[PDB]
Nucleic acid binder design. Structure first.
Lengths: 152, 52
RNA sequence: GGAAAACUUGAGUGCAGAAGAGGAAAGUGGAAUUCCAUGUGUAGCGGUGAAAUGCGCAGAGAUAUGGAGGAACACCAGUGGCGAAGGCGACUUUCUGGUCUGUAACUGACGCUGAUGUGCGAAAGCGUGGGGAUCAAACAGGAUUAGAUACCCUGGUAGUCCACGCCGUAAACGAUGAGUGCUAAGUGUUAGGGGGUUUCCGCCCCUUAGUGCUGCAGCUAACGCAUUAAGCACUCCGCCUGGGGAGUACGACCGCAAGGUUGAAACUCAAAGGAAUUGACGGGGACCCGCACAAGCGGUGGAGCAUGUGGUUUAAUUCGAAGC
RNA sequence: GGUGGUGCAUGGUUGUCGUCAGCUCGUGUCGUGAGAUGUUGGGUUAAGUCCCGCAACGAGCGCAACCCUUAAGCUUAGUUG
């Protein structure tokens, strides 16, 4: 029911492993087909190469990795007819936390391996330092409405 | 014809756009774009002014 | 009806002033599109809903103290004013028209319609000289678009602008002919006369002529009108009485033409028409609702099957479905 | 005997618009009539679901649960459970 405009946002649960709502919201994103026991336990094996390439703990590195995915300018195409409609949108932190995690489990499946025992381990610690993989959520909107700043 | 100094350019842009606003200069070259007939120039002189 | 008088409202001749785009003639200056030249410079400038034709290497435009042309002259600009109407607009002046108020001096109704006649007569068209600076029929170019040269665009011809001849036509309509009496109001505003306070030129109010906006009784079919009557009365002229055919044949008049004015019938249809009502759809606007769209997650179409449709096929591949 | 024909002779009868929420009557009044008011203006909402204010009042149909049940209770019999 979107034609009323704003719908209330859906809420999160913090897992007792980390006491973080986003750790289980990282669990709620990796659940392809909603597989709870079959993907979370294998994502628990798929931070073992994430923490192999990064000695810092997960609760610090997961707010480090998405901090290079949270943008300041995204694009919402407005009805302007024959224009590029590239309107800069400073994100509300609800969707800014949401959009930083949306492109993560979209991208693990086009690398050299195709096993989610380590597809989620391949994907995360390539996408922490604002270079490649999931930063094209953030860094490509920083090269989309900027060379054409005439179509805000 | 209005010089804006002793400030920044923002209120100088907001003077130039205001000196444009309080003038029959940009409105006159808006007035003098094309021709309206004197059977219809009084339609502008009544529907904007005889109702005012 | 004629005969002898007067009064002045009504009208004219008086007097004191207001205003202006009212017609025909002389000046002052501004700004602009076009040109030629300086400086300047070199890649684009113009034009485009979308790009392009074009204009660009000559400097195209640009750019200013300053060089010019065509033609008009925002500001004072208004349900302002004047003109019978077509109309009237930078002004300074010339010649005036005419409006209006006030005092009302005077002549003693000197009036209205208005057939004839005479004028004006908007725009375009028949032509002349400034005209082609801008605009622009006709013509041109580029593409769009499913369709072009159409909606887009310019260049550009007479025609434009004005003066010099007209034609005699417009929704020239306030869709209300012109002159006179009488019946609810409020409300601004244009000019003159009237003032009370005063004002430091302004408040309130009488009146005239009007310019406007709302609004009784009366009115009509209703709209709507109601002191700037389609109300209540009088006088004159003109026009009308079904629609086409028809402003049409012919004839008459005019015109330089364009063509115009004047102005029927045969024959056919019994409906045309004016108001006001309910739906209808809307490429007219507005308002809400929907995994309708977006926000996210897969599938079918990707390819093997088997399932019955539609094609074939038979004497059967029964018979009916068939967009949600 | 007909499935031989004919939904279009038809009784039906369903799906659709469609969750669409809209749809009707008596007394007033007003109109020469053609016809209009009760469902609306203000604020509050999931749908004739509100209250104020409205020339309205009365009468409605669908209208929410009412029917079945989730679950959260109590009570009964401990029955082969």
């Amino acid at each position: 029911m979107p034609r009323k405009g704003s719908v209330p946002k859906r809420d999160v649960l913090p897992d007792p492993i980390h006491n973080s709502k986003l750790v289980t919201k990282l669990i709620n994103k990796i659940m392809l087909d909603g597989k709870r026991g079959t993907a979370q336990r294998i994502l628990y094996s798929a931070f073992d190469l994430v923490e192999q390439r990064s000695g810092r703990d997960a609760l610090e590195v997961f707010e480090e990795a998405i901090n290079n995915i949270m943008p300041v300018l995204e694009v919402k195409a407005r009805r302007v007819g024959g224009s590029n409609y590239q309107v800069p949108v400073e994100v509300r932190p609800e969707r800014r936390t949401t959009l930083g995690l949306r492109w993560l489990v979209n991208y693990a499946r086009l690398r050299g391996e195709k096993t989610m025992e380590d597809r989620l381990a391949n994907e995360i610690l390539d996408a922490a330092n604002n270079t490649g993989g999931a930063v094209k959520k953030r860094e490509d909107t920083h090269k989309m409405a900027e060379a054409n700043k005439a179509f805000a | 014809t209005v010089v804006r100094k002793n400030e920044s350019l923002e209120d100088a842009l907001r003077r130039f756009k205001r000196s444009v606003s309080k003038s029959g200069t940009i409105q006159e070259v808006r007035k003098r774009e094309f021709y309206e007939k004197p059977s219809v120039k009084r339609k502008k002189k009544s529907e904007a002014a005889r109702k005012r």
